[PDB]
Amino acid sequence: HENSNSASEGSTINYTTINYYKDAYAASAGRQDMSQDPKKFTDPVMDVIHEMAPPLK
Amino acid sequence: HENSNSASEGSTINYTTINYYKDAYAASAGRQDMSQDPKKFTDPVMDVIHEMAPPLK
Amino acid sequence: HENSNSASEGSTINYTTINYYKDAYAASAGRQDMSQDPKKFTDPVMDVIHEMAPPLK
Amino acid sequence: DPIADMIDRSLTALQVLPTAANTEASSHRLGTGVVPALQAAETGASSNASDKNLIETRCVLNHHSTQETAIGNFFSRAGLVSIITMPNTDGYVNWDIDLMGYAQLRRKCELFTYMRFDAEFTFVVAKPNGVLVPQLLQYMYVPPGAPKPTSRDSFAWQTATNPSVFVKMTDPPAQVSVPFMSPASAYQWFYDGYPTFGEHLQANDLDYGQCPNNMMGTFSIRTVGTEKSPHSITLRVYMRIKHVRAWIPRPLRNQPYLFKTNPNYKGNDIKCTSTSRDKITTL
Amino acid sequence: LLQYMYVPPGAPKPTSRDSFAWQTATNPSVFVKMTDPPAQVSVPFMSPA
Amino acid sequence: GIPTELKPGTNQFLTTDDGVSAPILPGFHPTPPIHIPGEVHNLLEICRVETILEVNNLKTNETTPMQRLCFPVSVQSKTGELCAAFRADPGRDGPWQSTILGQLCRYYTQWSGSLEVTFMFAGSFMATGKMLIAYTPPGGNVPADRITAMLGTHVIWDFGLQSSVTLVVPWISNTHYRAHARAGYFDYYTTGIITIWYQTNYVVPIGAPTTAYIVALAAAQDNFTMKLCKDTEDIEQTANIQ
Amino acid sequence: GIPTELKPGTNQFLTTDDGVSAPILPGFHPTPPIHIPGEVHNLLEICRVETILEVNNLKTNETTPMQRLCFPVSVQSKTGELCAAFRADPGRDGPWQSTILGQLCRYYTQWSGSLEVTFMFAGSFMATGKMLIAYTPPGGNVPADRITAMLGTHVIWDFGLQSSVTLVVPWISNTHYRAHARAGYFDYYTTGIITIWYQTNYVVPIGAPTTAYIVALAAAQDNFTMKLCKDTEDIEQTANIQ
Amino acid sequence: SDRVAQLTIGNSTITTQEAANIVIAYGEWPEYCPDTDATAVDKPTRPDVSVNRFFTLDTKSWAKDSKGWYWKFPDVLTEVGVFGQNAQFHYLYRSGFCVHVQCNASKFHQGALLVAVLPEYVLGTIAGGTGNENSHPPYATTQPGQVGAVLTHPYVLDAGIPLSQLTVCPHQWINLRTNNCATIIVPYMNTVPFDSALNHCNFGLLVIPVVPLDFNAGATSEIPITVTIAPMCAEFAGLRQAVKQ
Ligand SMILES: CCCCCCCCCCCCC/C=C/[C@H](O)[C@H](N)CO
């Protein structure tokens, strides 16, 4: 196969990349993932807050 | 197939070489082997020496 | 297929020739055969001569 | 069996190591008799003491690859071997094939004793100031024993058998592949002895170290036309090394080179191997 | 700009730079420039014997 | 035929590019290989072989360079003197430039793993003594006395029948790899200071000489690795060869 | 279309390159082949056919070159004389240039295998004698007498009904192949010296002539091979043909 | 219990009571040439007793300021014994070796020797001092015979490579406080399976004093060094009359 040496190998992007050489960083970018996690930036709070209840009672 | 004439045919390297011509020395280098033998350079000694015992007793 | 028109078609050479056109004389040479017959040039003699016996007795 | 007299081992085998070896955990130790810290360098074997036998270590899983240290990746890089100029003045040059003319590739290849490889040659050609002029050129490789061209329009330029390339100056650079072509089983960069028999004297003292298994003939270029071209030409030759196998490593040279054929050095300024300092106690 | 033309035995030959034989209605011919890579063709075995 | 386009990167000569080229000799066959002993498959097999370290690289030893391989140890009147000190950078100039490891690290840039330093006593048989060999992680300078230097990793050496001891220099660094250390900004990649101290005195009886020597050998451990090949600067070509 | 790039090696005309070219005659058909006897499939079938060796290539035989194919043997008064000597290099100039093997080796560079040399007596019927044909491996010069030359490989020949003997020259060399030997450095690839000596005298009765001749034929054995094709230097073109 | 050793081959026997271990160079035993690698067609000759034995060369004198000595192989054995005769009457040879160096001193001396076997040891000159002469070593320097020659600039080994990394070759130490001998077993290492013995020299043996010899006045000031060698699996081929060189 190819000696896999890229920047994104642990958690990677989609499997449509094209390559003709033996090193994996020569490959194209391809199309990207649609994965996202918002709640570790918009809700970094220990005790969970519900939208219905008062948050400070 | 191809009339095999390379420099490394007896003990060779990995099977990922690309070639379009009929002679095997026109082919690419490819990726290499990971094989190594250190003990014929670091321990060229007839009687085996263990790391725990005294070596000169 | 191709309308076969080469110089060597009756007794031919190896089957590794490459061609992209429709005429067979456009094809490559390829690798050759290892066949040879020495005895019709070194021994053109009716009565068979053995190497052990005297040849003129 | 009328005569009872007539009827009558490798050390270590190789294995693959993709990554560097891990480090296992350890603790302290108090005991007598067993000692890994004491060695004996007199036997010519190197020491086998690891990290865990001297201090206490944790567990470390490393994934450092050893790919860049292979001999294939160390040598497969094109390096300069020749500069050939046509001011020689008759439109052709005959250059003897000797790959020891530039010190940066000579030092790497002299690290091993015996080598076996296939090459790949590339010719980059322009005027002596980098200028480009449309011009037709011809390269011809002459094996040892073949006749050589003596003029710009000799009969040797018909190339009925010889491999040859025709290329222009405005084109991309030419590339060829050369197989392993020695009469012996491997090239050697050192040959201790004389090539011929008979008496060795002071007239034949220059024969020492010239092995004929490395002399590969000559190399000839010319401008194609039968007249005198009005431009100065300069050729640069680059060589890659493929399918490498090597044997019997050597110490590396620490003195600057003097000639292409012998390891002679300058005898007055013997260069010390390390850069000197003032005191032994102060770095 | 250059033109090559192969004339089989029996065919008429061009006698001038602008003759009617240069129309190449049947003859194999190549048109190639000086700055180009060199031309290449393939010829089969064509003897009566 | 098939429609194509040429992309950027056309007609360039890349020296480290790997491709397929046309051959010049069709049907050629090489000489068949024979078994020759001592085949090298990897450059890390050479880096585990110990070579001699040039500790005593003084300015007065440039005209008699056979003395730079041995550094002396003599009878002291006081206690706790230090005998030698040097940096543990295998890539920086200094004592490590004379090794087969120090010359092979110059062809690369980044390295990782642990080292080892083997000392060998070469005095008489009746002589004795004890030495302390310490390795100090960076942050401090060379220690002024023994009671500062014993805080780092250290091994106490005893002369006797076994005349060799190995101080292993363990890999303690913040990054996974280390570049070649130098004065300026690249001293961030420094690795420490190795000193050596008199544990006791060097005691000799009557009739045996009072001055002995110590040779020092250096090698690499099994988890050693390198990357990013470059050229060395130890060699040069100013004048044309031949 | 498909993205591509052009690599180095573009637009070059390599003379030994094998590729596919465009045809000029679509639908053409050749003349059908007939069976013609004597087809050559390989050039080694010619190298096993013996041709005449030119042993007697003296400077006085340049105006009467029919005598260079036969060398004489006469009645001697002394014992142990030598009659001829030459080198066994098939590629070097000299007696081997007149053979079909010596002309076919010039189109190559390296050769291997064993040879053979066949001698044929062409004297009268009543004449007799014995000859010694020796082949000496390199290291020494031509031997001064018979008792030095009999140490190498040698065969004793007897005249009679069978008038032909074959001295086989076995392949004894350090390398697998041999280049073309020459004065200078390439005499390292030399292969030996072949001499021929009087074992007994050449005895003839009354009425039969006292001078006979010997022709010499040369060929190759079955393990002969060649490689690395080049051009010969025996032919030239100084003036233009026609 | 491994400090004593005994080596016997032929009709000779070497014994030692303070010995280090045995070094096999590159971990390969010497052996006869197999049929897969052979190229010569003549049947080889094996004397197998009269050439596989210990031969003792001359004895050098270790002073307080010595430089070092070297011997070229197998030039040292080409004029002695029946091995000196089979190497003169043939064209090809092939043999391994087994080197044994003895040097003994008392418990009141000190010093250290570095023995090493170096293949393809090509010597050089100082190029006329200033470096502009294309000098060449004479025949007496490159092939000294069974006497051996001394070194001039031992820091560069008279070949441009430093002493500091000579231990990459197979090697041992003779430290005067522990042992008194060193022994290496060398196989046959060349690009061709057979070679001439008069025009090719395979390896060189180097004995270089790293730590100088020192003693107090009154002790035995005469320290000798003696080298003893032995071929292992000698074969010969290609018979021809005697040519010495
Ligand atoms: C059209 C192709 C022309 C190029 C022909 C190149 C063939 C010659 C390749 C020689 C391979 C290396 C042989 C010896 C290398 C060194 O010059 C010698 N060892 C000198 O010591």
Short mmCIF file of N, CA, C and O in Angstrom, two decimals, chain F residues 78-160:
data_model
loop_
_atom_site.label_atom_id
_atom_site.label_comp_id
_atom_site.label_asym_id
_atom_site.label_seq_id
_atom_site.Cartn_x
_atom_site.Cartn_y
_atom_site.Cartn_z
N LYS F 78 43.31 16.82 47.60
CA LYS F 78 41.99 17.20 48.10
C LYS F 78 40.95 16.17 47.67
O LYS F 78 41.25 15.19 46.99
N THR F 79 39.72 16.41 48.10
CA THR F 79 38.61 15.51 47.83
C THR F 79 37.57 16.19 46.95
O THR F 79 37.38 17.40 47.01
N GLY F 80 36.89 15.38 46.14
CA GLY F 80 35.76 15.87 45.38
C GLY F 80 36.09 16.76 44.20
O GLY F 80 35.29 17.62 43.85
N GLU F 81 37.25 16.57 43.59
CA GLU F 81 37.55 17.31 42.37
C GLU F 81 36.80 16.71 41.19
O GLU F 81 36.41 15.54 41.20
N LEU F 82 36.60 17.52 40.16
CA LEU F 82 36.04 17.03 38.92
C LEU F 82 37.15 16.86 37.89
O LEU F 82 38.13 17.61 37.89
N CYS F 83 37.00 15.85 37.04
CA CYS F 83 38.07 15.51 36.11
C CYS F 83 37.75 15.93 34.68
O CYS F 83 38.65 16.28 33.92
N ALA F 84 36.47 15.91 34.31
CA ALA F 84 36.07 16.29 32.96
C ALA F 84 34.61 16.71 32.98
O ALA F 84 33.87 16.39 33.90
N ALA F 85 34.22 17.42 31.93
CA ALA F 85 32.84 17.85 31.72
C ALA F 85 32.66 18.20 30.26
O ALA F 85 33.57 18.78 29.65
N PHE F 86 31.50 17.87 29.71
CA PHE F 86 31.17 18.22 28.33
C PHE F 86 29.67 18.16 28.16
O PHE F 86 28.95 17.60 28.99
N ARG F 87 29.19 18.74 27.07
CA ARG F 87 27.78 18.69 26.76
C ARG F 87 27.42 17.36 26.13
O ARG F 87 28.26 16.69 25.52
N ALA F 88 26.16 16.98 26.26
CA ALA F 88 25.68 15.71 25.74
C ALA F 88 24.97 15.85 24.41
O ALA F 88 24.14 15.00 24.07
N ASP F 89 25.27 16.90 23.65
CA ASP F 89 24.66 17.10 22.34
C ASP F 89 25.41 16.26 21.31
O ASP F 89 26.59 16.54 21.05
N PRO F 90 24.79 15.25 20.70
CA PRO F 90 25.49 14.48 19.67
C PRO F 90 25.63 15.22 18.35
O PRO F 90 26.49 14.86 17.55
N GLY F 91 24.82 16.25 18.11
CA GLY F 91 24.89 16.99 16.87
C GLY F 91 25.73 18.24 16.92
O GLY F 91 26.25 18.65 15.88
N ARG F 92 25.87 18.86 18.08
CA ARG F 92 26.70 20.04 18.21
C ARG F 92 28.17 19.65 18.07
O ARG F 92 28.56 18.51 18.34
N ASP F 93 28.98 20.60 17.60
CA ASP F 93 30.42 20.40 17.55
C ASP F 93 31.00 20.25 18.95
O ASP F 93 30.43 20.73 19.93
N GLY F 94 32.14 19.58 19.03
CA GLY F 94 32.74 19.27 20.29
C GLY F 94 33.20 17.83 20.33
O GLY F 94 33.61 17.27 19.32
N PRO F 95 33.13 17.21 21.51
CA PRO F 95 33.63 15.83 21.65
C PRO F 95 32.84 14.79 20.88
O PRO F 95 33.39 13.74 20.54
N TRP F 96 31.57 15.05 20.56
CA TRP F 96 30.78 14.04 19.87
C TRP F 96 30.98 14.05 18.36
O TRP F 96 30.33 13.26 17.68
N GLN F 97 31.84 14.91 17.83
CA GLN F 97 32.03 14.95 16.38
C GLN F 97 32.92 13.81 15.89
O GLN F 97 32.98 13.56 14.68
N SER F 98 33.61 13.13 16.79
CA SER F 98 34.53 12.09 16.39
C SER F 98 33.89 10.71 16.32
O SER F 98 34.58 9.75 15.98
N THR F 99 32.61 10.59 16.62
CA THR F 99 31.96 9.30 16.70
C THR F 99 31.33 8.93 15.36
O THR F 99 31.08 9.79 14.52
N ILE F 100 31.07 7.64 15.18
CA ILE F 100 30.27 7.22 14.04
C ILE F 100 28.81 7.58 14.23
O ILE F 100 28.06 7.64 13.26
N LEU F 101 28.39 7.84 15.47
CA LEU F 101 27.05 8.36 15.70
C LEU F 101 27.00 9.86 15.41
O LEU F 101 26.05 10.36 14.81
N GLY F 102 28.04 10.58 15.82
CA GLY F 102 28.09 12.01 15.58
C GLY F 102 28.28 12.39 14.13
O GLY F 102 27.87 13.48 13.73
N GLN F 103 28.88 11.52 13.34
CA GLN F 103 28.99 11.78 11.91
C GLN F 103 27.75 11.34 11.15
O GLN F 103 27.48 11.87 10.07
N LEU F 104 26.99 10.38 11.68
CA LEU F 104 25.76 9.97 11.03
C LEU F 104 24.58 10.84 11.43
O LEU F 104 23.57 10.86 10.72
N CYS F 105 24.66 11.54 12.55
CA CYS F 105 23.59 12.46 12.91
C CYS F 105 23.66 13.73 12.09
O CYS F 105 22.64 14.42 11.93
N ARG F 106 24.83 14.07 11.57
CA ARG F 106 24.98 15.26 10.75
C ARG F 106 24.26 15.16 9.42
O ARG F 106 23.89 16.19 8.85
N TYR F 107 24.04 13.95 8.91
CA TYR F 107 23.27 13.76 7.69
C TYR F 107 21.77 13.82 7.93
O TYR F 107 21.00 13.64 6.98
N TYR F 108 21.32 14.05 9.15
CA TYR F 108 19.91 14.22 9.45
C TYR F 108 19.73 15.49 10.27
O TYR F 108 20.68 16.23 10.50
N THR F 109 18.49 15.74 10.68
CA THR F 109 18.21 16.93 11.47
C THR F 109 17.63 16.62 12.84
O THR F 109 18.12 17.14 13.84
N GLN F 110 16.61 15.77 12.92
CA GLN F 110 15.93 15.51 14.17
C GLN F 110 16.17 14.08 14.62
O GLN F 110 16.16 13.15 13.82
N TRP F 111 16.41 13.91 15.92
CA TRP F 111 16.71 12.61 16.48
C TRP F 111 15.95 12.41 17.78
O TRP F 111 15.50 13.37 18.41
N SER F 112 15.83 11.15 18.19
CA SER F 112 15.14 10.79 19.41
C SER F 112 15.72 9.50 19.95
O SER F 112 16.37 8.75 19.22
N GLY F 113 15.46 9.23 21.22
CA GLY F 113 15.95 8.03 21.87
C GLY F 113 16.98 8.35 22.94
O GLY F 113 17.29 9.50 23.22
N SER F 114 17.49 7.28 23.54
CA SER F 114 18.48 7.41 24.60
C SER F 114 19.86 7.01 24.10
O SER F 114 20.00 6.27 23.12
N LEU F 115 20.89 7.48 24.79
CA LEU F 115 22.27 7.18 24.47
C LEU F 115 22.86 6.26 25.53
O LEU F 115 22.16 5.78 26.42
N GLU F 116 24.16 6.01 25.41
CA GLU F 116 24.93 5.39 26.48
C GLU F 116 26.39 5.80 26.31
O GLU F 116 26.85 6.04 25.19
N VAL F 117 27.09 5.94 27.43
CA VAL F 117 28.50 6.28 27.45
C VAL F 117 29.23 5.24 28.28
O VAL F 117 28.93 5.07 29.46
N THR F 118 30.19 4.56 27.66
CA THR F 118 30.95 3.52 28.33
C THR F 118 32.35 4.03 28.60
O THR F 118 33.03 4.51 27.69
N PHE F 119 32.78 3.94 29.86
CA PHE F 119 34.14 4.30 30.25
C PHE F 119 34.92 3.03 30.53
O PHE F 119 34.35 2.03 30.98
N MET F 120 36.21 3.05 30.25
CA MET F 120 37.08 1.90 30.45
C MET F 120 38.38 2.36 31.09
O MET F 120 39.05 3.24 30.56
N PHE F 121 38.72 1.75 32.22
CA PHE F 121 39.93 2.10 32.95
C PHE F 121 41.12 1.37 32.34
O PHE F 121 41.01 0.20 31.98
N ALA F 122 42.25 2.07 32.23
CA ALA F 122 43.41 1.47 31.59
C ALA F 122 44.67 1.68 32.41
O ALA F 122 45.75 1.89 31.85
N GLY F 123 44.56 1.61 33.73
CA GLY F 123 45.69 1.74 34.61
C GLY F 123 46.33 0.41 34.92
O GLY F 123 46.14 -0.59 34.22
N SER F 124 47.09 0.38 36.01
CA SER F 124 47.77 -0.83 36.43
C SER F 124 46.79 -1.79 37.10
O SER F 124 45.59 -1.56 37.17
N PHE F 125 47.34 -2.89 37.62
CA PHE F 125 46.48 -3.85 38.30
C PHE F 125 46.35 -3.54 39.78
O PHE F 125 45.29 -3.78 40.37
N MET F 126 47.40 -3.02 40.40
CA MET F 126 47.39 -2.76 41.83
C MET F 126 46.64 -1.49 42.19
O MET F 126 46.33 -1.29 43.37
N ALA F 127 46.35 -0.63 41.23
CA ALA F 127 45.72 0.65 41.49
C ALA F 127 44.23 0.46 41.70
O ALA F 127 43.64 -0.51 41.21
N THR F 128 43.62 1.38 42.45
CA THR F 128 42.20 1.33 42.74
C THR F 128 41.63 2.73 42.84
O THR F 128 42.34 3.73 42.68
N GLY F 129 40.33 2.81 43.11
CA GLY F 129 39.66 4.08 43.26
C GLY F 129 38.19 4.01 42.93
O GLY F 129 37.71 2.99 42.44
N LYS F 130 37.45 5.08 43.19
CA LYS F 130 36.04 5.15 42.87
C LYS F 130 35.72 6.50 42.24
O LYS F 130 36.21 7.53 42.69
N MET F 131 34.90 6.48 41.19
CA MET F 131 34.53 7.68 40.47
C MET F 131 33.01 7.82 40.46
O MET F 131 32.29 6.82 40.55
N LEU F 132 32.55 9.05 40.35
CA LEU F 132 31.13 9.36 40.27
C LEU F 132 30.86 10.06 38.95
O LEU F 132 31.46 11.09 38.65
N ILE F 133 29.94 9.50 38.16
CA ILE F 133 29.62 10.01 36.83
C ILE F 133 28.17 10.47 36.86
O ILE F 133 27.26 9.64 37.01
N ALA F 134 27.93 11.76 36.68
CA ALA F 134 26.60 12.34 36.83
C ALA F 134 26.15 13.02 35.55
O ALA F 134 26.96 13.59 34.82
N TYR F 135 24.85 12.97 35.30
CA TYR F 135 24.23 13.62 34.15
C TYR F 135 23.14 14.55 34.65
O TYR F 135 22.20 14.11 35.32
N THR F 136 23.26 15.83 34.33
CA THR F 136 22.35 16.84 34.86
C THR F 136 21.45 17.37 33.76
O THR F 136 21.96 17.83 32.73
N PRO F 137 20.13 17.31 33.94
CA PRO F 137 19.20 17.87 32.95
C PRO F 137 19.35 19.38 32.85
O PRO F 137 19.85 20.01 33.79
N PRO F 138 18.93 20.00 31.74
CA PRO F 138 19.26 21.41 31.53
C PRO F 138 18.47 22.34 32.44
O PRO F 138 17.45 21.97 33.02
N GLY F 139 18.98 23.55 32.55
CA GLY F 139 18.40 24.54 33.44
C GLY F 139 19.48 25.14 34.31
O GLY F 139 19.45 26.33 34.63
N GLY F 140 20.46 24.32 34.68
CA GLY F 140 21.59 24.81 35.43
C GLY F 140 22.87 24.70 34.64
O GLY F 140 22.91 24.02 33.61
N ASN F 141 23.93 25.34 35.11
CA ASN F 141 25.23 25.29 34.46
C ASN F 141 25.99 24.08 35.00
O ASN F 141 25.39 23.17 35.59
N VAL F 142 27.30 24.01 34.76
CA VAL F 142 28.09 22.94 35.37
C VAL F 142 28.12 23.15 36.88
O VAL F 142 28.16 24.31 37.35
N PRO F 143 27.94 22.11 37.69
CA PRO F 143 27.92 22.29 39.14
C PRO F 143 29.31 22.62 39.68
O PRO F 143 30.32 22.13 39.19
N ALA F 144 29.33 23.48 40.70
CA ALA F 144 30.60 23.95 41.23
C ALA F 144 31.29 22.92 42.11
O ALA F 144 32.51 22.93 42.23
N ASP F 145 30.52 22.04 42.76
CA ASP F 145 31.08 21.04 43.66
C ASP F 145 30.34 19.73 43.48
O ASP F 145 29.38 19.63 42.71
N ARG F 146 30.80 18.70 44.20
CA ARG F 146 30.21 17.38 44.06
C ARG F 146 28.81 17.32 44.65
O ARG F 146 27.93 16.67 44.08
N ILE F 147 28.57 18.03 45.76
CA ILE F 147 27.30 17.93 46.46
C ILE F 147 26.16 18.63 45.72
O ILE F 147 24.99 18.48 46.09
N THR F 148 26.46 19.39 44.67
CA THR F 148 25.42 19.86 43.77
C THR F 148 25.18 18.87 42.64
O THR F 148 24.04 18.60 42.26
N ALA F 149 26.25 18.26 42.14
CA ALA F 149 26.16 17.41 40.97
C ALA F 149 25.54 16.05 41.24
O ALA F 149 25.13 15.37 40.30
N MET F 150 25.46 15.62 42.50
CA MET F 150 24.90 14.31 42.78
C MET F 150 23.38 14.28 42.78
O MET F 150 22.81 13.23 43.07
N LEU F 151 22.72 15.39 42.48
CA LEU F 151 21.27 15.41 42.50
C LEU F 151 20.66 14.83 41.23
O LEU F 151 19.55 14.29 41.30
N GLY F 152 21.34 14.91 40.10
CA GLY F 152 20.87 14.32 38.86
C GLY F 152 21.06 12.82 38.83
O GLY F 152 21.33 12.17 39.85
N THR F 153 20.92 12.25 37.64
CA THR F 153 21.15 10.83 37.44
C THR F 153 22.64 10.55 37.56
O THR F 153 23.45 11.21 36.91
N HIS F 154 23.00 9.57 38.39
CA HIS F 154 24.42 9.33 38.63
C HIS F 154 24.66 7.87 38.96
O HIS F 154 23.78 7.17 39.45
N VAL F 155 25.88 7.43 38.68
CA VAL F 155 26.31 6.04 38.87
C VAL F 155 27.70 6.08 39.50
O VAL F 155 28.55 6.86 39.08
N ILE F 156 27.91 5.26 40.52
CA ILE F 156 29.20 5.18 41.21
C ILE F 156 29.98 3.99 40.67
O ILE F 156 29.47 2.86 40.65
N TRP F 157 31.21 4.24 40.24
CA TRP F 157 32.04 3.27 39.53
C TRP F 157 33.12 2.77 40.48
O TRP F 157 33.69 3.55 41.24
N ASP F 158 33.39 1.47 40.44
CA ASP F 158 34.40 0.84 41.27
C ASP F 158 35.37 0.09 40.37
O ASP F 158 34.95 -0.74 39.55
N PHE F 159 36.66 0.36 40.52
CA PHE F 159 37.68 -0.35 39.76
C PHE F 159 37.90 -1.74 40.33
O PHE F 159 37.82 -1.94 41.55
N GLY F 160 38.19 -2.69 39.46
CA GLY F 160 38.45 -4.04 39.89
C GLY F 160 38.74 -4.97 38.74
O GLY F 160 39.54 -4.65 37.86
#
